Amino acid sequence: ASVEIDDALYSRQRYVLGDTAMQKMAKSHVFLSGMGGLGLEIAKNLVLAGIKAVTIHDTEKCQAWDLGTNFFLSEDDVVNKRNRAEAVLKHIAELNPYVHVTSSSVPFNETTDLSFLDKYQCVVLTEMKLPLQKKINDFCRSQCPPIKFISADVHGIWSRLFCDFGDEFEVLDTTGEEPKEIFISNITQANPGIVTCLENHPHKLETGQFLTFREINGMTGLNGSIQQITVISPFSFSIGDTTELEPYLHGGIAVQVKTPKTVFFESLERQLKHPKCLIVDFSNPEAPLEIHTAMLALDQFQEKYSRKPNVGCQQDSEELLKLATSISETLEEKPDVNADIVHWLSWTAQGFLSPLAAAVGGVASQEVLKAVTGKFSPLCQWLYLEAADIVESLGKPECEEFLPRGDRYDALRACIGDTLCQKLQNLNIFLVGCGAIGCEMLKNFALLGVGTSKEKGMITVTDPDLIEKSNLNRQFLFRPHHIQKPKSYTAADATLKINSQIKIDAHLNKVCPTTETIYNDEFYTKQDVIITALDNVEARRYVDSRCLANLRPLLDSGTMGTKGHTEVIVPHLTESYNSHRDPPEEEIPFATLKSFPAAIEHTIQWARDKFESSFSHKPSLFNKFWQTYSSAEEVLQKIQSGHSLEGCFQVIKLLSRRPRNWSQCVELARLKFEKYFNHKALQLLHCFPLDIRLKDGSLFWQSPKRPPSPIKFDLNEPLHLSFLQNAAKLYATVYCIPFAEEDLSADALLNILSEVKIQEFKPSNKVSEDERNAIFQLEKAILSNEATKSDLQMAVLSFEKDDDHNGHIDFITAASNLRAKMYSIEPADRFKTKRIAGKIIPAIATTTATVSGLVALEMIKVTGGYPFEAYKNCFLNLAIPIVVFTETTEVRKTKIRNGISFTIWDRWTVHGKEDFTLLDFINAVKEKYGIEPTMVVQGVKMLYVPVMPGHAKRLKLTMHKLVKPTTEKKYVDLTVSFAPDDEDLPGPPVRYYFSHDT
Ligand SMILES: Nc1ncnc2c1ncn2[C@@H]1O[C@H](COP(=O)(O)OP(=O)(O)OP(=O)(O)O)[C@@H](O)[C@H]1O
Ligand SMILES: [Ca+2]
Ligand SMILES: [Ca+2]
Ligand SMILES: [Cl-]
Ligand SMILES: [Mg+2]
């Protein structure tokens, strides 16, 4: 458990799961049976996660039908009749090199001995008969430690997932949240001793919980101790004898210790008779047990007749209903059978829906990780995902639509029908972003057949970014030899490997207004659907605005660690993304960042800002100044003449104080350290001593503020040497100074610093000339030949969180922690500071696969033009686990009294002529739509307000003069507000047309 986890590959996953959990995965061997789409999806997610060893088992040989459900199989494999597991093994191995993947072709029978399974910690079973599953479940739960058991299957549009980790299973962390921290006001010297908490915040503890202690002064003995506590009252608890310990003074933090929690699982047989579920939708509470009855009936039918129901066959469907009614009588609550679920299960049972399998596989993969690590709360036995909304809106369809045509889409055709398959083939989709969700979506397109008709199919994928190692953890199309290559291009070539017929147009562009020429209104109207795999709200709002303008549907999705969400936006049926409450995340006060920090977050922000200011902004301004004003002699002449040059002062100082060699950079780092962590504290203490109190009679340096303490530089201390080394390197690269690791040695730095250290004890600040000083500096520089063109140029650094060599993160961490030490806030690790400073989002493959599969199901509904009832928005948290499906937000229709009602999608149109005035436009809007404009705006430009200066003049002005198109386009779009209400009300966009010629 001392292995070094590769942060370069698993950086985001480490934020989701934690190093300890990953270390447990590094020891885990998992056995997976059945290599259909579901099994391959699960194996893919587990291998990417880093499970030490995955055994891949299948008895069946490749067929054409498999080519539709398997994204690594080939026609060559089908012709040679290779084993499904053996054919795909190298491709799966390529996903994670650290993992060891092995294939088994051993037949699995009742006669077969199950002893071999003892090597594995977890067993996942797909495409296996229920009787043998029960036998393996008994074997696995009877072992000690018990082998954890998962059973997963997808039949048509219905799915079944089961988890049994043993009669007793230990959940080490339930939510994944950091443990709560309590602050100690006092601790008594008594038997038992009593710990007391700050009166502002109660501890909210339990009389049995265990707490660890740190940062106590006086009672130094308690630090590092774990004590089981007894709650005396809110704000007070009893730990144990403290009389022998030294008397308490101040401080102290108590952190709760997570105690392993026991969860109990019943066997597969017991659960089949009496199943357990977490019911999410109380609109349909009985749905899961009805699906359970139908799926169990399907298993009984498979046993009796050794085959699944045929599409259309009434004898088979009637027999399945009989078996379901019998099962319902055996079930404890005598649940009434659902005929629709049984009918559709018989109808689609021979089909396989790949998007649903992607979703189920993501959920099942997370369950495997839960079994081997204990990191999250496990599925409490059953999950029954369904795609019933896809088949319900079709109506009563022709059984011939769902009959095979001898092509790879037979599986999909058995679930959704040939007509919708063809609609998917004849599709124009715009995929904005090609990240984790983008890669999963491209796989789901290739298996669904999207854009495969040559004549009228196209998938447009656009991304500006290049591939990185950290991406490889969750972007399975990309591989290590693709690093530093465009994402869109690489994904397109891989997607073509999955499906040769697919048509993909790949771009390296960013979807912003600058590229609106490439992605114009014509382009959007051509596109049947737009799907956003973005990471920022600004891009989502821009694409949402574009979709609203061109009345096209948008599918939006996102992943945060184990959390995920899907949003479906359909024109004229649902509300759009821009309709949200759009709250800004945070707005730290300048005072709290630059003078009075209270949190490690504040200091990390200050360190990031200092990195950008020192090594990006100032170099950029320096280069721009000298290129704009050419020679230094010309700049001096301009300054003496009296011309105004922006930023002359700072640039001249930088040129005067420019480092020329490594020792100068080391000196600069030392002086900057002194200014940041010594002088700032003393100057703040001078303007504001601890004694001053007058905000409210007698108040200052209260609980929010922290008084600073000066820091004394010691090269022996670790943070000090780290700051010096990384700061000097960064300054040196900015000023193009050559240096070597020999220079970075602490001994060499000590010879530079201690021998030649000028540290004057500066007095407090508070305790024409500047222009002349700059003139003197510039004069001396040009005189000494120091202002050569080479010295008037600097190098600009770009913050890169993912390069350990560059030293950006190490400088930020040292600066943040040194500032924290000054204000006494507790430090943060390098990786925690990296996450905060780089705004890294925790990400894992299971969640992205789950979210993407769900979005693909919604895309199927959108291509069929389904009703509002069918579309569903989703929120998933795989930690709980919970999946919440809600009806999509209904389009809001706003009507002003005696006005035409309007929605986000509607745009009102008014026509213009050569002789037209603002008053004419106002009257025209009132005539056509029944409501009178009381405000007119173009862009940010204000055209009309009734309560404004000179409103009457503007009312009669001609429209062409009032607008300033420049484009001299056929129309200009104006925003309109109406008075009725004591505030103005927004109205639909009004489009004015300059040319009519009628
Ligand atoms: N306006 C835009 N147009 C096109 N692609 C965009 C736009 N904005 C962001 N993207 C892309 O959206 C994708 C989002 O996916 P993802 O979360 O994996 O990003 P990432 O950079 O790989 O994240 P991380 O930094 O955690 O590795 C990225 O490929 C990013 O390049
Ligand atoms: Ca339904
Ligand atoms: Ca990137
Ligand atoms: Cl500075
Ligand atoms: Mg991103």
Author numbering: 35 to 801, 818 to 1031, 1035 to 1051
Lines quoted from the article behind this entry:
The covalent modification of target proteins with ubiquitin or ubiquitin-like modifiers is initiated by E1 activating enzymes, which typically transfer a single modifier onto cognate conjugating enzymes. UBA6 is an unusual E1 since it activates two highly distinct modifiers, ubiquitin and FAT10. In the presence of Mg-ATP, E1 catalyzes the acyl-adenylation of ubiquitin, initially forming a ubiquitin-AMP adduct. Subsequently, the E1 catalytic cysteine attacks the ubiquitin-AMP intermediate to form a thioester bond between the cysteine and the C-terminal glycine of ubiquitin, resulting in the formation of a covalent E1~ubiquitin adduct.
